[PDB]
């Protein structure tokens, strides 16, 4: 770490040629941040901060994560209440049962009431292709199945095909992320659905020290 | 800012907490409501009587049986630590909020100071 070399020579000798040759030889799995000296003079933060930011960009990290997702077309949705009215508070909504269909068969799932709340938020009806992540409990509405494409002869619906493979597919995901990416994520997180969050989202992403 | 970064302050905070797995909750409401609550640990079990504000906090936290919760007797704030392992089988997919933790050991009421 911290080794430095200088490509010294006259104009039109091959300094940039050697730099790009090094980049090509290293391969696409090794970070390579090109720069020019003039770009360091920012107007939002000190040039020292911009040098630090760019300097960290060239430290890549390869992190792998296995994720389990439930995806398919909804066939049934039968919310159930607790066996006793005294069991819970208010609505006293218990687990929900959802039926998903894929190219390889069907599966009946038992879901938490939080997952049911996510379903209600995403406005999912019978026949819609959905996508549930057991990692976080996040529900995504892919769209309507191509089977029901011609149900109505004029309707604004994003018809999507039936998911391939099994309903419950487990995949190992590998991504390369820079240290600066983590720094940005901590500095300017994208989470939050409050009005304050939206107002901050509309703001320009000015660099900060 | 650089100068103050080079000086550190070591501050001590004293915390009094009760943590344990709630066994049974029984609430009666007309007038104000009254109820009794039982919390157990790995080596203790106790029945407590709940005031109106404590019941209100319990309801607003939506606590159920088998949950490990922490109450600060100074303020009465109720925090849900997590769920027991025995309830893990009940679902195929789990929400982000759910957590599985063991039952705390020792005495129900504990005093702890943190620096």
């Amino acid at each position: 770490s911290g080794r430095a070399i200088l490509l010294a020579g006259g104009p039109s000798t091959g300094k940039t040629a050697l730099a790009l040759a090094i980049s090509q030889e290293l391969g696409p799995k090794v970070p390579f941040c090109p720069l020019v000296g003039s770009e360091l003079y920012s107007v939002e933060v000190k040039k020292t901060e911009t040098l630090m930011e760019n300097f960290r960009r060239a430290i890549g990290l390869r992190i792998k994560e296995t994720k389990e997702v439930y995806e398919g077309e909804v066939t049934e949705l039968t919310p159930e209440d607790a066996e006793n009215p005294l069991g819970g508070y208010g609505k006293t909504i218990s687990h929900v049962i959802v039926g998903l269909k894929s190219a390889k068969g069907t599966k009946t799932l038992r879901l938490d009431p939080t997952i049911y709340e996510s379903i209600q938020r995403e406005k999912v009806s019978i026949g819609d292709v959905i996508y549930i992540e057991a990692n976080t409990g996040a529900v995504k509405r892919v769209g309507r199945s191509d089977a029901y494409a011609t149900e109505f002869d004029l309707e604004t619906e994003e018809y999507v095909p039936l998911p391939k493979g099994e309903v419950h597919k487990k995949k190992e995901i590998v991504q390369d992320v820079t240290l600066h990416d983590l720094d940005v994520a901590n500095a300017r997180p994208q989470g939050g659905q409050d009005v304050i969050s939206m107002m901050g989202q509309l703001l320009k992403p000015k660099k900060t020290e | 800012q650089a100068f103050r970064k080079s000086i550190g302050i070591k501050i001590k905070e004293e915390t009094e907490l009760i943590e344990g797995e709630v066994v049974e909750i029984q609430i009666d409401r007309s007038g104000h409501k009254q109820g009794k609550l039982t919390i157990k640990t790995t080596d203790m079990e106790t029945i407590y009587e709940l005031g109106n504000k404590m019941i209100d906090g319990l309801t607003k936290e939506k606590v159920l049986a088998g949950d490990v919760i922490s109450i600060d007797k100074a303020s009465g704030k109720i925090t849900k630590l997590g769920r027991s392992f025995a309830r893990s089988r009940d679902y195929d997919a789990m929400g982000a909020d759910t957590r599985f933790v063991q039952c705390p050991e020792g005495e129900l009421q504990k005093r702890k100071t943190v620096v």
Partner: peptide, 28 residues
């Protein structure tokens, strides 16, 4: 009251100042 009538005494003092189970839970 509007027809110049007094209110209930307990209600009067309460307004001047201002059983069955409903929820039972147990782990199976």
């Amino acid at each position: 009251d509007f027809p110049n009538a007094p209110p209930n005494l307990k209600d009067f003092n309460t307004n001047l100042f201002g059983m069955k189970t409903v929820f039972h839970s147990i782990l199976p």
